[PDB]
Each structure stands twice: as C-alpha cells, then as structure tokens.
Amino acid sequence: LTKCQEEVSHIPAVHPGSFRPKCDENGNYLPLQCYGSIGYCWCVFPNGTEVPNTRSRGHHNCSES
Description:
CATH architecture: Irregular
Distance between the termini: 20 Å
GO biological process, one term: positive regulation of interleukin-8 production
Domain Thyroglobulin type-1: 1-62
CATH topology: Invariant Chain, Chain I
Region (Required for interaction with CTSL): 16-17
Shape: flat
Main location: membrane
Organism: Homo sapiens (Human)
C-alpha cells in the first residue's frame, strides 16, 4: 500500500460530509483530487500535495497520465 491507498481504505466510500482521496495505477495520489461532499476539486502532485490555486468549484485537466 501507500499513504493514498491507506487513506482510501481507512476513509470508506460513506464519506459524504468529509473529504476522501483517490489513487492511480502506481498507488500514488491521482493528480486530480475532489472533496465530493462540497463538489470542489484541486490538482495534486503524486505525493498528495495540492498544486497552488487549483482548488476550485469542480474538475480540471490535471497530469492524470
């Protein structure tokens, strides 16, 4: 596992009211993350750190390779 796959395991899909991460084909944080409970998203680096000022009202075309 990874910190992503751990947090995605430990925060179940029954997250409405909170954030839940997402992960890629290499177990790293998916380059787009979404706080579905408010419908917001941001881009992240593979380590899960937000890409500055991407935090917005919906999805964007991040490096999701």
